[PDB]
Symmetry: C3
Subunit: 316 residues, 3 copies
């Protein structure tokens, strides 16, 4: 048993202690909730982005900087590694909490979801629930959350608001670029569970890479760019206790297994009438997967990096 | 003077404290010996594999994750760096202790060898012996060692069994794949000393990389795969106080300098009647070496990465 | 506000505590100044080189090992990342202090410059000055500094000599190779400010890579080699609050924008009558730049890695 909230706490404490170094701004709300601004008014940075990503993954993953170089496209990249794949990426990292309090809307991700159980079905499917007296949630938003947003999150997690920590950054920020690319492993795990209905607790180890998107000048375009890093630039290495249907599942895993594949996400979005429900959920996957079946010793691969679409997306 | 056992201890203590996070299982035997299971019953992982490798290298090296990408073969890789090349890789890392107690057999590597002096000739040749009241040994085995194996190791090291730590993983595990690939620098140093009879204390700094093998379904095949990562996928950068015979030595260093080069190790093994003695010891070397002569400023290179043999080995 | 001296101190303390592990030799002078030899008599190493580089950058950057592989040239490389670009690289890292006391000459770099203000113009231009009771300076020299050099540096920084720390390594050492390649980001920032007269406080985040030069057998050749790593092997990713002249500035940023571009620095130096003043200051820049305009979302690129000149430089 590992606690995603307890294992994320030391990283949060480090971010608070090193706030100036990280360009994050920390404030306490009147209910006692600590809000760590990582990109709304604060500048944040690469280091804030890496820690944000690790906090998001429940302290159960390492997220580090590396380089992406393919077909004359060179970018900074993240490298994500976890030995608790389902729990790190799905019990924590997945943005599965739509947080809406009054006039505030934001997608919430990170270990607090494992206390509030958002959504409940995920936790039943992977058989996980956290027991912790602290709650940590990451909010993707262009606005800092006020006291009643904090109160709501703290309440649903069953903790005192003094023991709630909220990390916040917009999509169009360097922390946005880093933290979204860091979910390259997660999107693979989520598609396995939700779309392909595979038992993701079979996935024992995981590591992956994805380029870091050039920061757009608004959150809408940044959503497209950061998604494209995964769909067209992401590679995931999975190590699985496999079965008979593993080879077929691997062929269905990459983003190219979708009919929506081929264009920058912004164009996929536009052609879907700006409606997420009209997009094939199977398109939200890594460009390239390499899967080692631990029970047979075999390796299955599917998908490719698509530098052309990345160049189109970033206007390069 | 650096102690390989004292410098490895903090890493062992970290592994014990973070056992759940690492998927390692720690138990104390009746004589007081601590056994850290990193892959027999415990799952282990990448992080357990990296720490296992660093413990093996006496706390005198950094072993980190990176990526291997050549000719359409992309795998996770290790990057190994040490500023104590002979001591880290030969006084500690080398699997030079055949541990056999009753019905238990295992190859032992790591800093405990520098107390027990296994084999004695290596320590005379590099002029090193550890002085420490703790002993740490890594065992490559499909079975966890019992009390009398621990007692034997503790006795030969001259320490109380309460101050002995045993790390264990099979070849066919992710920790197996990581820790074997991490000896890419070591195999170069060992061949220099043993095969080419070079003074390896001339080697001042070293760094190297090797792909991490897809985990096989048995230890025998895993031995071949993990060896191939070094022989056909390994690159070593050595910085040497050189002499007149340095250029000739470098040409003889890579695995291709052997007549056994060209096929996956499993096939080299089969053609040698499954007898290690009938294999040319010069084949146990990195695919590619780059050697900087610190006294002349010159650089000598030899060997190449062989992606074809790697693909054959992993059935890709 | 971040202090480059206070943030570098913990790294200095780590180097002193782990001196044996790092192959650095620490001594106290009679005025109380601590001198950390990282390559004159001490061997140093990769790890000493990485810490030296981070100390040099005021504890405001991460410098780690990675790999450089282009056109059949494979070398170790550094990866440099900072979220305080102007302060880390210009208030600290830049070798802007010509230290000359008696018969001792050395280029001084690192956070002590932010106390002594060397040169004063840089600190006025970026609006930065450190407030710290400790001073840390890195000296590139083939000789260890004696008491009166230490006294001079301590005096100009306004600190007691007991609170001064001097790190020393020659150009022709592995620490020399590492620490010079680590200024790949710095040379870009310096050219922006000094040559192109751009407001470098607009640069919000930065990351870059450069190969580590094979160590030459004298400091003169090592100067050429280590410079070539940046000029012909360096890539810098900058994230800027841009303006209207950003695209033109980016085209002027790489080393190829200079008429002196094309040959190893040793040959540029020889053709300039061994006079630094006859060399175009614009040639001291990264080979390749990738610049993300944070205000428009656009990315501008200029320059290329030149493996041919690197091979010529290292005689490969």
């Amino acid at each position: 048993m590992v606690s995603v909230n307890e294992n994320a706490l030391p990283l949060v404490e480090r971010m608070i202690e090193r706030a100036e170094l990280l360009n994050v701004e920390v404030q306490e709300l009147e209910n006692g909730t600590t809000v760590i601004d990582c990109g709304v008014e604060a500048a944040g940075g690469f280091e804030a982005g890496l820690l944000f990503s690790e906090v998001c993954m429940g302290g159960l993953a390492t997220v580090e900087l590396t380089e992406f170089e393919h077909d004359g496209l060179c970018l900074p990249a993240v490298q994500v590694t976890t030995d608790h794949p389902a729990v790190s990426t799905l019990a924590a990292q997945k943005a599965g909490w739509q947080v809406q309090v009054g006039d505030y809307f934001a997608m919430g991700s990170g270990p607090a979801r494992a206390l509030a159980l958002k959504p409940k079905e995920t936790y039943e499917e992977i058989d996980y629930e956290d027991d912790a007296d602290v709650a940590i949630l990451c909010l993707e938003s262009s606005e800092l959350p006020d006291e009643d947003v904090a109160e709501h999150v703290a309440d649903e997690c069953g903790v005192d608001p003094e023991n709630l920590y909220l990390l916040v950054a917009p999509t169009a920020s360097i922390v946005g670029s880093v933290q979204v690319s860091a979910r390259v492993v997660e999107t693979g795990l989520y598609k396995l569970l939700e779309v392909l209905e595979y038992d993701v607790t079979r996935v024992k180890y995981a590591t992956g890479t994805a380029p870091i998107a050039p920061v757009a000048d608004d959150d809408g375009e940044a959503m497209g760019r950061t998604n494209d890093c995964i769909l067209y630039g992401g590679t995931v290495y999975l190590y699985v206790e496999g079965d008979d249907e593993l080879p077929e599942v691997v062929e269905e895993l990459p983003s190219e297994a979708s009919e929506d594949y081929g264009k920058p996400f912004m164009k996929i979005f536009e052609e879907a009438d700006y409606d997420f429900y009209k997009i094939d959920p199977g398109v939200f996957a890594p460009a390239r997967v390499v899967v080692n079946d631990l029970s047979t010793g075999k390796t299955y691969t599917a998908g490719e990096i698509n530098v052309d679409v990345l160049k189109e997306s970033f206007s390069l």
